[PDB]
Design a protein around this ligand. Structure first.
Ligand SMILES: *[C@@H]1O[C@H](CO)[C@@H](O[C@@H]2O[C@H](CO)[C@@H](O)[C@H](O)[C@H]2NC(C)=O)[C@H](O)[C@H]1NC(C)=O
Ligand SMILES: CC(=O)N[C@@H]1[C@@H](O)[C@H](O)[C@@H](CO)O[C@H]1O
Ligand SMILES: CC(=O)N[C@@H]1[C@@H](O)[C@H](O)[C@@H](CO)O[C@H]1O
Ligand SMILES: CC(=O)N[C@@H]1[C@@H](O)[C@H](O)[C@@H](CO)O[C@H]1O
Ligand SMILES: *[C@@H]1O[C@H](CO)[C@@H](O)[C@H](O)[C@H]1NC(C)=O
Ligand SMILES: *[C@@H]1O[C@H](CO)[C@@H](O)[C@H](O)[C@H]1NC(C)=O
Lengths: 98, 596
């Protein structure tokens, strides 16, 4: 029960917007001032992962690797690809952009 | 701010919150039923109590959304199911009274019955297994002794409990706006939503009575042939011109007529189609049986069974002395945790029931996509129908030849297939009148249609009018015969059997005509016919999310209890049997008096 997800919200979350707060959600016509009750439900719920669940309900770890480019130098790269080095030979070379 | 959106949010919460409780209860029940021991026996108490309390709280809370303004049919049906509070709708005193009555019925079922002190050595003819199929041998007087002893040991004890149960349940139904308990039962088959496909609750009785009449000649001729073929346990009071006693027909109550097989098949020279010798010779075990059964559903396009089904499910070698009830069971837990409870041995019945349980599981995983209040069969008899139609198709000789359990050179003729048809007609044709008369008697009693005049005489004359069997001895009101059956003792639905029986052959004919077959239905194997599988999956997916009329019309053309497929399946048997009945007249004397 260490994993939780939100079930009710007033408006669809904007892209990459996050709302970690746990205020009482008012789905009804009247406010409830933080008191759980009719049409005022806690907006967090627990998965309750058991280890005999099927594939459709087993806990899947999900990583969303997002790439962001803005008006700043690209400080993260993935050029983890290098060959050997030979000398005394006329060859082509690309030394980190050279 | 509208009521509809509030109800949508409430149902969105409830569907998620019910899953954990249902999984807890299901896992506790499975672990207890796998092996009876105190440490997990005690778990089921709290597991059931927590689920019941959560359901009661949700049902009480669901009241503030009125049903009038609902426009979405899905949430309408969801709330209608949820607002049907059931045993929580009435006062607590009646609740504990009903709980005590259910516990007393369960104890009566569990507790055995002992014979007279002259022979108390063995009196457990029930047994924890399939041995209940065969209770007594080819007898005439001690069989009726056993019948009357069981009836006296059940009815004289359960008559007032059942009467008070009827009274309290009628009060419950009247409080819940239904006409009676029969109204509550029929409400499962009723659809009051989409027009054109609508079906009222009062139409089921007339549909059943209309669909029963088209097969009366078949049952009449079959019963006349069986009565003429008995010839050995002759009725000592009535000449074979009249009717026949009811106790001789196989089981204790005559629900199934398989036991009569060995007493009536004419062609004893031609053996019944058996694979047991090849079953043992080729070293077939439970794993091979279930793999072969799975291949059948794989061929017709249904998905590969989920990994871990065999791992979690147990099917062989109980080992522990306190063995589980070896009756077949298919368990659905949460999502994807489908499993089976089995006691496989290499026999005819186990091989036949493997496909039935596979069909159960397949229907479960087909409708698993629906919400929690909708993942179920559309009708109360849809699940057994889906199980039995797949169970009925794999037993074709062509399928056995393809598997290799039958001789490649083995030839069929007008002598073997007629025997196959007779064997499968004893277990189908005779079951319809029993279910029909039992359910109509149930509806008459629960609705107060019958007076205080002893219901036993009405039940007897009704059975002899429909089933065509006369009771062996007269009875007074002190007995209650129907409650002796498990599904009446525990108050379970019974018309699902009739619906299963008709729907099985309806979908069989539909899928077999889709299976490009020519000739009699009973020789067609739906294997490698993908169109039939797709047609069946068109209805299996919906579950309860759509009206049952839509689930029946989208595959078979008809929308109601159309019985033509059953007769089209069993016509060769009828045509062959007419020659036997050329001299054997058809018709029973309902005015028969066994006492005279
Ligand atoms: C009723 O409410 C459902 C709830 O989502 C609406 O959404 C449809 O749900 C059904 C499932 O029963 C799907 O088959 C549809 O594809 C869904 N449609 C949409 C647009 O989401 C549904 O539209 C509502 N109305 C009706 C008449 O069902
Ligand atoms: C059939 C089965 O699972 N039986 C279990 C056994 O495996 C377990 O070791 C024991 C103690 O927990 O309880 C019982
Ligand atoms: C009018 C009314 O009673 N509505 C609901 C009812 O369905 C429920 O069974 C009961 C629980 O106390 O009260 C609430
Ligand atoms: C019992 C039975 O079916 N007998 C038939 C017989 O009437 C028919 O003349 C013959 C022709 O092949 O086939 C066989
Ligand atoms: C089903 O699964 C078994 C084992 O997991 C595999 O051998 C077989 O090829 C599968 N069949 C299909 C149709 O995926
Ligand atoms: C169905 O397909 C399987 C696939 O190998 C085949 O072995 C079998 O003979 C086929 N059955 C029929 C009746 O065509």
């Amino acid at each position: 029960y260490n994993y939780r997800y939100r079930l009710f919200r007033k408006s669809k979350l904007k892209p990459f917007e996050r709302d970690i707060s746990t205020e009482i959600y008012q789905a009804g016509n009247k406010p409830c001032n933080g008191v759980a009750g009719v049409n005022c439900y806690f907006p967090l719920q627990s998965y309750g992962f058991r280890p005999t669940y099927g594939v459709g309900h087993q806990p899947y770890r999900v990583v969303v690797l997002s790439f962001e480019l803005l008006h700043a130098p690209a400080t993260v790269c993935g050029p983890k690809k290098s060959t050997n080095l030979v000398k005394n030979k006329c060859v082509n070379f690309n030394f980190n952009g050279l | 701010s509208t009521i509809e959106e509030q109800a949508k949010t409430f149902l969105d919460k409830f569907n998620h919150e019910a899953e954990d409780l249902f999984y807890q209860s299901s896992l506790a029940s499975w672990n207890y039923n796998t092996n009876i021991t105190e440490e997990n026996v005690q778990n089921m108490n709290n597991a059931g109590d927590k689920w019941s309390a959560f359901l009661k709280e949700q049902s009480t809370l669901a009241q503030m959304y009125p049903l009038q303004e609902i426009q979405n049919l899905t949430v309408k049906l969801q709330l209608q199911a949820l607002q049907q509070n059931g045993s929580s709708v009435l006062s607590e005193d009646k609740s504990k009274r009903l709980n005590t009555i259910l516990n007393t019925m369960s104890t009566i079922y569990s507790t055995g019955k002992v014979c007279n002190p002259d022979n108390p050595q063995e009196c457990l003819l029930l047994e924890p297994g399939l041995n209940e199929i065969m209770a007594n041998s080819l007898d005439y007087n001690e069989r009726l002794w056993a019948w009357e002893s069981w009836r006296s040991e059940v009815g004289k004890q359960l008559r007032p409990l059942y009467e008070e149960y009827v009274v309290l349940k009628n009060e419950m139904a009247r409080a819940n706006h239904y006409e009676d308990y029969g109204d509550y039962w029929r409400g499962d088959y009723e659809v009051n939503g989409v027009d054109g496909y609508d079906y009222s609750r009062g139409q089921l009785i007339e549909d059943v009575e209309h669909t029963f009449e088209e097969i009366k000649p078949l049952y009449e001729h079959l019963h006349a042939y069986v009565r003429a073929k008995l010839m050995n346990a002759y009725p000592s009071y009535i000449s074979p011109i009249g009717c026949l006693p009811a106790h001789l027909l196989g089981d204790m109550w005559g629900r199934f007529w398989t036991n009569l097989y060995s007493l009536t098949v004419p062609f004893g020279q031609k053996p019944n189609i058996d694979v047991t010798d090849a079953m043992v010779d080729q070293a077939w075990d439970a794993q091979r049986i279930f793999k072969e059964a799975e291949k059948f559903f794989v061929s017709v396009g249904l998905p590969n069974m989920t990994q871990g089904f065999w791992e979690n499910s147990m099917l062989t070698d109980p080992g522990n002395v306190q063995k589980a009830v070896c009756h077949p069971t298919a368990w659905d837990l949460g999502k994807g945790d489908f499993r089976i409870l089995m006691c496989t041995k290499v026999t005819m019945d186990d091989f036949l029931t493997a496909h039935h349980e596979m069909g159960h599981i397949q229907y479960d995983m087909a409708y698993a996509a629906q919400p929690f209040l909708l993942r179920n069969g559309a009708n109360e008899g849809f699940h057994e129908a889906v199980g039995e139609i797949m169970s009925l198709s794999a037993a074709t000789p062509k399928h056995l030849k393809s598997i290799g359990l039958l001789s490649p050179d083995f030839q069929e003729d007008n002598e073997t297939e007629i025997n196959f048809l007779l064997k499968q007609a004893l277990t189908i044709v005779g079951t319809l009148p029993f279910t029909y008369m039992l359910e109509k008697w149930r509806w008459m009693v629960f609705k107060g249609e019958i007076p205080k005049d002893q219901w036993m005489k009405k039940w007897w004359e009704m059975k002899r009018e429909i089933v065509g069997v006369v009771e062996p001895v007269p009875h007074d009101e002190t007995y209650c015969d129907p409650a002796s059956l498990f599904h009446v003792s525990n108050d379970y639905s019974f018309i699902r059997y009739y619906t299963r029986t008709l729907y099985q052959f309806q979908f069989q004919e539909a899928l077999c005509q889709a299976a490009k077959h020519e000739g009699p239905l009973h020789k067609c194997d739906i294997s490698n016919s993908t169109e039939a599988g797709q047609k069946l999956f068109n209805m299996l997916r919906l579950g309860k999310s759509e009206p049952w009329t839509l689930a029946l019309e989208n595959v078979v053309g008809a929308k109601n209890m159309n019985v033509r497929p059953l007769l089209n399946y069993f016509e060769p048997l009828f045509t062959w049997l007419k020659d036997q009945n050329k001299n054997s007249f058809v018709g029973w004397s309902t005015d028969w008096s066994p006492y005279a």
